[PDB]
Symmetry: C4
């Protein structure tokens, strides 16, 4: 029964080792969870950045392309998707100049560029400058007012 008691004691000490290692597991996996959280945030960051750059290069290439009387191409949205396929694809300036106002706002949202709710006068120009309609004729043309 003595040996039972000492054995008992060692057991409890064994319990303590077990317990502290279990705590080791607890905190280590806590740090792992936090690290994975922050990596996920980092990856979200990188996704936003790649999509941004995509929009940028598509635009700037339409820009040069416009100098040769060549049609422009579609442009992705600040989040990556192709625009709402009900929303008319864009090819030249009068296409814009004929668009509806709500669609103009939709677009302006699609390119992440902020406008004023009252100054219609700058919507068309700023949208042009967003997609890349930049040629000399693109400057000399005059936008029409809405209905």
């Amino acid at each position: 029964m003595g040996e039972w008691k000492k054995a008992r004691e060692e057991d409890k000490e064994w319990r303590k080792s077990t317990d502290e290692r279990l705590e080791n597991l607890l905190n280590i996996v806590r740090e792992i969870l936090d690290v994975q959280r922050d990596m996920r945030n980092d990856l979200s960051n990188l996704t936003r950045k790649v999509d941004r750059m995509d929009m940028r290069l598509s635009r700037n290439n339409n820009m040069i392309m416009r100098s040769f009387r060549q049609p422009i191409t579609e442009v992705p949205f600040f989040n990556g998707d192709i625009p709402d396929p009900n929303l008319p694809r864009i090819t030249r300036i009068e296409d814009i100049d004929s668009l509806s106002e709500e669609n103009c706002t939709r677009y302006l949202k699609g390119y992440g560029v902020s406008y004023d709710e009252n100054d219609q006068s700058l919507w068309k120009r700023q949208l042009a400058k967003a997609v890349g309609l930049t040629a000399a004729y693109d400057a000399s043309y005059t936008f029409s007012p809405f209905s």
Copy 2:
């Protein structure tokens, strides 16, 4: 034997703490597994997007380059690899205009652009517009029919 009994009980309570911490490990590592699943999905997303943009810029640069009677360069596939090295590299328009139909379909698949199985007439033009053959002569040239 009394002390044995109370000791026994404490052991059992100790068991309960052990058990609930073990459950802590279980669910925390479950969330970690799910988070890693997600992250993997996110990274797949980012890979697709980077490859996409790669194709886009290669094309658009061949586009400008075509304006100066300069040869075009090879173009990656929507998934990144170089094309099937048995598939003839592309340098100018007649190269396409001499290609076999099955190879045309192969290409059209390689650039992720959908065509119609019956309208051969638009394959060549749409492939051109995919790689970047855009010059004025590129418009004035007439494609030949297949064999």
Copy 3:
């Protein structure tokens, strides 16, 4: 009581299995923590590299664009942010040639290009060459000295 003793021993052996598996958990999660550390370092690396390339392409595109008397666009910083919005956006060369010295240093820091604290004479030219002011007139123009 015999059976108690042998049973006791078995449990001790059972304890050893438990212990070694716990060590298995310990070292495996250690390696996981290290692997996540190094992945985080890798991702930081990739972020720096993507931002770098972003700056590069923005610049080089302003470069071509300058050949056609077309205005330049803003440029990101070596770390990604848009410049200090109090810091005047840049459109052409005289804009620089009118800037204050401390702002020049700020910029030069923003583009990660090193200069000399005494040789003011090369600041303006090197900043130009950093953003892309490259045209023939951009070479023939003479910078003004500071106040």
Copy 4:
């Protein structure tokens, strides 16, 4: 003592639950380690691919830029670093045509393009075609032999 015995057995069964959950931890963290291994491989893949594309676009842009008698820019290596800063930066064709042979080999390695150890005659041309020296004069010029 009866109750001691039954209690003892339940404990043993409790041990079995503990053991199988521990195995649950073992294999689940094994899969996690493998998944992280493979993600690391995937990320290495993505790094190589982004650097590749970087080299590609830098080159192709020097290509167009060459058509206007404009100086070329430095080019990254297949692994991302800037070249050995003791290795002379490249600006035009005669710069190459004056280079040492070992430096030529160094370069050819820097751009991941394979050459023949005996045919010196194609080194210079292929290096040109690697960086982008593409203009009509770039074709009409004749390379000089080594010392």
